[PDB]
From TrEMBL, chains B, C:
Belongs to the short-chain dehydrogenases/reductases (SDR) family. FabI subfamily. This is Enoyl-acyl carrier reductase. NAD(+) 2 binds at Y20, W40, D77, A78, L125, A126, K194, L224, S226, A228. One of its GO terms (biological process) is fatty acid biosynthetic process. The chain holds residues 106 to 408 of 417 of the full protein. It comes from Toxoplasma gondii. Keywords: Fatty acid biosynthesis, Fatty acid metabolism, Lipid biosynthesis, Lipid metabolism, Nucleotide-binding, Oxidoreductase, Signal.
Length: 302, 303, 303, 302
């Protein structure tokens, strides 16, 4: 009864597997009585579906009481496209999309409205920076704009198409990284840039969507977590691995950051306990954000 | 769900049912915490009687239909750390007659004695004698008092409770936006002392996080007509706070009445295992007012 | 005093005498810089004629009674990096007839050719086709355009000028408050793209600071009725910008008319050896509006 | 002519020697045509006076053109006291104060008004944390309150007593440190705390003083500099020495931070070039503020 989402329905954009923050959020949302629908990137939908029906993810679905998480729908969704006229021929051609239709944001909204009705909870757990491993001086207009398009406009588009089907008192969460506010070497490709805009837009949307639909809009700035999208930067030992160590050694709380930690925080920002909370960037990072200085620097002593 | 059974909390700065302290206490209990309270001695008697009568039973009802009961109500003056710090005027002050052992060190001891190690600590108190005065008209004695009562109190409170706090425990305090941007009428260096409070939340989140594995956070709240807010500007007319609430209602993303429960629940989260990777933050619980860079109802502006 | 003799600057985004770009140029020159300009090709002709006629000579007078002369006025489209990026419609666009070599790579080359390594770089341009539209009514094509023209342009500009910039050189860009807090009517994802711009200032201050020992800063400006600001909301009536200026005048610490010189001089500092330990900052040049947490002239509120 | 302060008069609180930021600010202000008066802590006034008349500081006074800096007055000033009734008997007793009167903020304001007239420029370059080397968990009410009183209220009091004698369009600068916003280990004793309040009050004063006198109010957050007050923390190799290294190795600009660097920045914030600038915290720190991560951490590689 302190968090109780029975009755409510949630849509979680960006779940391809059990290793990202999206999975964890969906897991907790569901754990609280909500109906949870996923939006899944089409090229990877096939393998995800397999994973689920094979019983290969039955461990990662175990809710505290042994029950397994049901998903009330798993929708093809490419949040780089707002509507049909936007999808290139080479994508409709592309083998990997071959099989499913109705995967633009406008179309997924429409599918969800009539399959499930109005929703309560909207989760944006997805980014894509083609040139993430390039520093800004080496990132191209096209790679920068793609990172913006995939990782920030995607959120605005989602709100634009889901807010009309969202109940008054609904809530929406997205996910940033500290790079948005402060320099993080290695996080390139205009991703820092895009996250900064994701944060700005979390504020503007909180306003526009607060007034138009009474729907809250918040962000979590989250610490490093070895998701599959995170392992692919530098694709040996790599961006995320060093990120995890740096935070272990320098954060106020010395502990492993678990995907569920963001899961819990998301649950709060999407629950009635947060009815007065909007426009916020909430740090879920063991407190790393609060430091002005490394405590494991070579430039002092151990 | 979130489950605080087995856990004990001390909420400091509870004298009535109208405070953010009350609402927080009411939410820790409804999640199954044991809740002991801290109450400024001058008003302890009138508070004890309010509970004991039954006047607060409306305000005491939890979701399950039962009634919050407290596990001890401690006299507490957060302006004092030790009994040597209490001056003669207060020892022999008529408002403080009957009450004993209310300095921070002593309360922390009796709380250890009577209850054992706590898990949760709330700092929900403030006081600045010259709050009505702008900063250009505020004195060293009163500004320093504002810092003493509203900022340092949180430092001492952590210092003296930290040791009796379980690994993975939480402390949270309460600020107002004025700490980051100017809110007129929020005077007496309360603005100053809330910025200090926020800074200390970060610094202590480090210190207490490294030493005790305790989390430390701050909720920056929006306007609420609590007893203390009513006292600001006091005549008997539409006060500082009335205008704050009106302004927020008219300029916040969410057009809404902020209720003490709204913070109750925001805090509940912060003091719960759901927040175990959250520390050192300033969580705006203000209907989104903080995010605005411009009032919408300005007279420069059309409706 | 501060002395820019021997130094050369390229100020990008100058088509009239009403812009913040103009005022900055006018201040670099009055400190004895050589100032070459960047001008969007569609308006280059009308700009060249304005200077050449003598219509701007009022706007051209420096403190010493003389007249700013420019060391070359380059056609520049910051939406394009290379001549392969320019599409056929623009190649054969009537507004672009006569002008050649205006992509960022090419301008940086001719600037190297004609003048050598520069010391100072100003980014004073923005464009977002759907600026009148709130974000909930903004398109991917237009939001992306806003980022392309107003944010990435600064990245490319540094990328392509960095190499021809002297150790200890400066670049500065221009933002608006909306990047941090909501300013209604500032739409089309201009808000979004200014936040990106500010973030990149920090990231590039690192990157360019480590590689070139170049500084990189951002002035967050207050409202000014420049040509581009007048175009926002355009009917023929009291516009978005008129209300911005009124609001600021009524709610800023300093009750004052913000003039383009106010930024001219703030920037001058940032691009001068006085600022050699300053990099990655967002300097509010806004009569102190940014510091406020509440409008004073709200209709919730009494005069 | 780009900065030209001839005619104007400045008062610089907190100059005891040629090694602090106060000296540098005063040096540049004077360098620009201003009359510059100093407020100097009484216990150290004697030695300072000596230093100046002995010709021992004639190097540090050399302005670019070889001319030497004149000071239009050097006032006893203990900014822990607002007015005569506030000074304890043991301080009036104290040998070190024995010799000079009129050293409270109210009295120095009054002395300056009639010796020099109305002023234009006010500089607050002073702090004192009795327990700076103690972390916050170990700092006492008294030490915390003293750090607040010395380093933050001091500024409010100065504005309170100088603003009445300040010309419209005047300007005022104080000096913070990054500890105010983000955790810096070693900077204890409630100094972080006080600086946070110094920043808050720079904003509130910009408002109160903007409206009441048309006087601007700004802060510089400055990087580490081996002033004499800075050498006394840890009083061997110590807080400031490590601070200087950490910033050398981790800041966007890899260069020595010189007292003049803050001097220049101060000059700007106190000049007509800043007439639209108020309420600001201006970072003069080689860009250290902008980083979210050390680049010399043990937790990666070199
Ligand atoms: N893992 C971390 O350390 C970390 C830290 C901070 C923030 N984040 C953020 O959290 C979010 C999820 O990241 P994660 O680590 O859980 O990654 P993840 O491995 O869950 O996958 C990212 C997801 O986005 C999807 N995606 C990419 N392009 C898409 C498109 N065009 N349309 C629809 N979906 C697309 C993929 O299906 C994938 O599920 C990301 O936005 C990221 O910015 C992650
Ligand atoms: N009410 C609001 O609008 C609002 C907004 C933002 C922040 N806050 C903050 O929340 C906290 C709770 O206050 P509130 O608004 O709920 O009203 P309240 O009436 O509950 O708060 C005042 C309480 O603090 C206690 N107290 C005051 N001075 C004390 C002292 N010297 N020693 C010990 N206890 C003392 C009193 O007993 C009283 O119970 C305050 O710290 C305040 O800064 C309140
Ligand atoms: N005027 C204000 O109130 C205000 C406030 C805050 C920030 N700013 C910023 O300051 C900068 C200068 O603009 P301004 O207000 O001085 O007016 P302006 O009319 O001088 O700015 C527009 C200029 O940028 C150029 N430009 C526009 N799109 C371009 C493109 N795609 N490629 C190359 N050049 C292009 C134009 O030639 C034009 O000269 C802008 O970046 C803006 O974001 C202005
Ligand atoms: N040096 C640094 O690295 C550094 C970094 C950031 C900020 N600062 C700040 O700059 C300011 C000056 O510091 P600095 O390094 O130049 O120190 P400094 O060596 O110049 O001396 C501090 C000054 O404050 C004075 N003082 C102390 N208590 C006083 C009192 N009660 N009344 C009047 N004066 C008093 C002393 O006379 C001394 O001149 C300080 O406020 C400090 O917070 C210094
Ligand atoms: O934003 C992130 C930050 C971190 Cl530390 C780790 C992973 C993140 O997520 C991504 C990073 C790059 C790409 Cl291409 C895609 C994704 Cl989902
Ligand atoms: O901090 C606050 C902010 C607001 Cl808007 C309203 C009340 C607040 O709380 C206080 C303000 C002044 C005093 Cl003397 C005591 C308290 Cl508890
Ligand atoms: O950024 C700005 C902020 C303000 Cl208040 C006023 C003008 C601004 O500048 C622009 C805004 C929109 C477009 Cl299309 C182009 C430009 Cl140059
Ligand atoms: O604030 C400061 C920050 C830094 Cl890095 C260095 C020196 C500073 O200045 C002081 C620090 C402590 C005390 Cl007791 C007095 C002063 Cl003037």
């Amino acid at each position: 009864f302190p968090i109780d989402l029975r009755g409510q329905t949630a849509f979680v954009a960006g779940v391809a597997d059990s290793h990202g923050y999206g999975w964890a959020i969906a897991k907790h949302l569901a754990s609280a009585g909500a109906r949870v629908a996923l939006g899944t990137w089409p090229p990877v939908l096939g393998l995800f579906q397999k994973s689920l029906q094979s019983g290969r993810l039955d461990e990662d679905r175990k809710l505290p009481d042994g029950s397994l998480i049901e998903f009330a729908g798993v929708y093809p969704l490419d949040a780089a496209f707002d509507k049909p006229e936007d999808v290139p021929q080479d994508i409709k051609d592309n083998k990997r999309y071959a099989g499913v239709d109705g995967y633009t944001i406008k179309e997924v909204a429409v599918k969800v409205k009539q399959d499930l009705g109005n929703i309560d909870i909207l989760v944006h757990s997805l980014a894509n920076g083609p040139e993430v491993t390039k520093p800004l001086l080496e990132t191209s207009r096209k790679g920068y704009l793609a990172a913006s398009s995939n990782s920030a406009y995607s959120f605005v588009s989602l709100l634009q198409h889901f807010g009309p089907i969202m109940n008054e008192g609904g809530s929406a969460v997205t996910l940033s990284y500290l790079a948005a506010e402060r320099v993080v070497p290695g996080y390139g490709g205009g991703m820092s840039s895009a996250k900064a805009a994701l944060e700005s837009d979390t504020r503007t949307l909180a306003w526009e969507a607060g007034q138009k639909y009474g729907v809250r809009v918040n962000a979590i700035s989250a610490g490093p977590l070895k998701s599959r999208a995170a392992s692919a930067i530098g694709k040996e030992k790599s961006f995320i691995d060093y990120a995890i160590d740096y935070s272990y050694n320098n954060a106020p709380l010395r502990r492993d950051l678990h995907s569920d930690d963001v899961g819990g925080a998301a649950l709060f920002l999407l629950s009635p306990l947060a009815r007065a909370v909007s426009g916020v960037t909430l740090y879920v990072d063991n407190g790393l954000h609060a430091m002005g200085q490394a405590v494991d620097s070579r430039s002092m002593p151990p």
